[PDB]
Amino acid sequence: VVANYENASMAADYIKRVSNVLPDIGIICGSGLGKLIEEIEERKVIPYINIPNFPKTTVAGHVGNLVLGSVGGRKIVAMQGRLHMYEGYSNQEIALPIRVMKLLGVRVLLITNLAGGINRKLKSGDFVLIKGHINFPGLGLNNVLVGPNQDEFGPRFPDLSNAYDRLLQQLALKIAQENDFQDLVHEGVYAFNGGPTYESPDESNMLLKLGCDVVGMSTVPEVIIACHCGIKVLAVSLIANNSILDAENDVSINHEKVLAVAEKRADLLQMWFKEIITRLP
Template sequence: MDKIINGDRPHQDHNARSYDTVKGVADWLLSRTDVRPRIGMICGTGMGSVPGMIKVRNEFDFAEIPHFPVSTVKGHAGKLILGFIGSVPVMCMKGRAHYYEGYDIAQCVMPVRVMKLCGVTHMMISNAAGALNENFEVGDVMIMKDHVNFLGLAGINPLRGINDERWGPRLFLTNRIYDKGMRQMAKQAAKELGYESQFHEGVFAMVGGPNFETVAECRLLRMMGVDTVGMSTAHEALAGHHCGIKVFAFSIVTNKCDVEYDSGYHISHDQILASGFRMELMIRMWISTIISLLSSELDDESIKS
């Protein structure tokens, strides 16, 4: 069941598109912490304990942060954590707000822009997803190389409206949203840990939700070359790329999509949560290794700046 926050359902905050509003949120956070994050993390469904690897300096409820969208979905704790993984300063969202919860799409990506103004240069985004690729198994991980954003194709785009050049250009290429260097580090980390057989690279599709996909929709997505499907991530990656953040994203395969009408296959949100929880130790070790590999790049950037 969705949580009710302060007696209200999610509401439209049209200030979420304003640079000044987002800067105000970033300033609010920075005035309450000495952490200056370089890596931003968005932990999706079933990944609630991953922030446990962080040496926490500060923790805020989404509800106490001005203008911040509050998550209402089971498995999304709604916490913003600032701290360190090793020596790397991070800002981590324990949960996210989805479009299907009733938020405007610009509100959903506001946290990404807050991260940018807090100093984040690299972003790691996770989601729980259904597998369309027949070679993927529950428990596998797909590193996102590209996406199909059905909301964006329908005009539900966080960049719609008047463009503020302080975020990025009005028109820009999206053929390299997912940073190649970070993807290579992720594959190297999986190999070093002996997880290589469980890791893949592919195309993610974002749909609106909250219902799971029909058989016909799954068949269509598979025909289009989509490997995993979920209800988040693409808009966050787009907003991050637009404002100059290096983006890395991955799907945790928590279920297989049903492409047969008489299969009797059943999936529930609780099953997806359980699948995600079972994989958390592996994911935590993998992310920790990626950040260790990434730390030298962050050090080089600090020297140059």
């Protein structure tokens, strides 16, 4: 199924009939960082499998819902169960839910992920406000926009220089200062590693030479689809480890260690993003 205007419209029609909510804000949350979705007020939970033209996700399994309701007095829509390109989903499958958000009325998309630290100033448990990216799949002919352009959503050749909104970054930092956890908050450039292997020690050393601050396996495809159709983005990485230190010390990362960092910061990240949603212009 192509992520075109007609197909996204049919999905938006089903959603509008079922939910009654007109959202201004969309959220996509990283693994272990989804507790806020369970606190949406007057919620409506819509399984992906029920929505016309949504991608099939039963090979991977696990949760896959769209959730609509209110947070802090604002109308939002959340994806519960993210689609990652390392699972084998196509460009069209990743893009359709973001384009449905656009047709529903979304103007701002908030995104969190888990990532590895490259910059020597980053420690496990730190947050990074993403200010730009290096898209290795995109340089190598696997950009999320490869294919026919869908003109109703955006231009054939987009400019990504303002993909990460500067005023949203400033508001996120302001709130961290108000609650005295600004010592945990950095800014940086995100490298997209297609995955699903954690980058090797020698790949990490290469990324340090190339000016990357953090590395991960998500987020950049959604950012590019959002920028293409005029949705503003704030993206925040939670740092699981420092891959450069680990390479010097011959220490390994694993998914168990990653999820333990998620649990350590989940409640603070929930409080942070609730206040960001409440304060958005």
